[PDB]
């Protein structure tokens with residue numbers, strides 16, 4: 340058994356302190372070990388991001404514009420959690436695909452069946468005006484060209500919407516499939532527990548101050564670094580059993596999930612952080628129907 | 631006579647401490663009072679910008695890519711000044727129009743007859759590689775749409791070229807002809823002596839650190855502010871005779887020019903800043919054929 344004692348898990352890309360030459364045969368290995376693992380991955384990252392904004396006083400009163408939200412099954416959980424906490428938020432879920440019917444019938448959540456383009460962003464900006472916007476993007480086109488086009492749309496989302504904060508889907512293209520350098524918004528590169536086994540995807544979290552928008556250039560050399568750091572994390576780290584972690588499940592992803600969940604606010608009061616987390620996790624798995 | 635005693639002139643947009651409701655009848659007033667006033671305006675701003683980079687140690691060894699450089703008569707002066715100072719610079723002047731023949735026959739200056747598009751920028755970036763680039767843009771399409779398109783090109787110039795510094799032509803569109811908000815690179819808004827009588831144009835000066843690119847949003851409310859601050863500067867300020875300025879010409883623009891010229895480096899040693907400036911100015915007027 341692959342055991343280890345760990346202090347804390349890697350929360351951000353910048354924390355990864357080692358690399359491994361990516362082995363292409365990894366792409367054939369089992370990508371998921373849990374049912375609805377994708378909704379779980381998304382729920383944890385978004386609970387983490389949104390709890391932070393609450394902590395900074397920027398959540399209440401905002402309109403969350405989630406683009407690429409369908410099916411969005413897990414979003415029902417997110418909405419319920421903050422709604423029950425007394426936070427006032429309007430949700431605007433936009434996707435050309437249809438949403439899970441559990442999202443219907445909520446006065447605070449608007450479902451839009453539209454694929455967004457720059458022009459549409461302008462009209463909804465005019466319509467949301469003057470509410471404060473929090474953007475969440477999870478749009479999916481694959482190719483490096485598909486990715487670049489996605490990233491380009493995400494930047495137009497921020498420029499037209501001009502949100503107070505954003506969570507963007509972010510996976511650096513493969514260095515060996517490089518087309519050209521580009522810019523992404525500056526922000527924290529949040530690592531994702533329960534991402535597929537060999538996924539190099541993270542979520543870019545940003546809070547906008549003043550009227551400045553800071554971007555950062557990404558080059559092929561950066562692409563090689565992302566690939567190796569993420570491969571090391573996936574191959575080595577995520578395969579660990581954290582024995583000094585006294586919790587029902589000691590696998591790395593549960594240790595990692597624990598650290599994101601401990602930052603979440605609950606109405607119920609708990610004697611220990613471990614009790615709150617077990618509760619949130621049980622609650623989350625029950626909601627998603629994960630045994 | 632319109633007299634006043636002034637400490638220093640307004641060097642940057644941010645220094646303008648007053649505003650005046652723009653009077654449209656100003657557009658009919660004489661725009662220029664000196665021959666080749668346009669080449670003079672350009673020469674002073676660029677001597678100012680380039681002298682700063684020299685001061686920061688980033689000029690020597692760089693390739694200056696000037697787009698929208700034709701005719702470029704004044705550029706001959708700029709090139710000679712730094713060349714004579716011993717600074718090693720390669721000039722790449724690109725415009726679809728032809729350059730003044732005084733620019734021909736210089737091994738250090740390459741004249742390109744091409745209107746640049748994004749694709750062309752990519753090929754010259756590949757070709758300049760790996761030299762450090764200093765971008766200077768003075769492209770001209772008029773309409774708010776023309777301007778926006780120009781600004782959009784200037785940002786692509788910085789993103790593909792990835793320069794160590796830049797000087798960009800910058801005039802905010804009229805609030806009453808607003809089309810949409812946009813972003814410009816962050817930098818100092820250098821005011822221009824000898825600009826036309828009622829011009830609201832300035833030059834955006836930037837030095838790039840790290841691999842970050844910081845932009846700033848410009849809105850219609852910003853447009854109204856630019857209009858009134860610039861109108862106050864043009865109508866009131868630039869019409870002053872600075873009597874406490876002991877110089878052959880006391881008009882405001884000469885007082886302003888003096889402060890930019892005092893930052894310029896010369897081989898010849900002078901006993902006073904006033905002697906260096908009189909010398910640089912005489913030299914500049916003689917070169918441009920201004921009486």
Ligand SMILES: Nc1ncnc2c1ncn2[C@@H]1O[C@H](CSCC[C@H](N)C(=O)O)[C@@H](O)[C@H]1O
Pocket residue numbers: 381406407408409410411412413414433434435436453454455456477478479480
């Ligand atoms: N222009 C666009 N606007 C809106 N949605 C888009 C888009 N292009 C792609 N997408 C959407 O991006 C999605 C990626 S899958 C997203 C899953 C969703 N976030 C969840 O919580 O279940 C697809 O549903 C797709 O239709």
Ligand SMILES: Nc1ncnc2c1ncn2[C@@H]1O[C@H](CSCC[C@H](N)C(=O)O)[C@@H](O)[C@H]1O
Pocket residue numbers: 672697698699700701702703704705724725726727744745746747768769770771
């Ligand atoms: N895509 C483009 N690439 C290069 N030059 C361009 C351009 N579009 C417009 N311009 C140029 O922008 C110029 C504006 S006038 C510039 C004057 C010049 N800076 C001087 O020192 O004399 C015109 O010469 C025009 O041909």
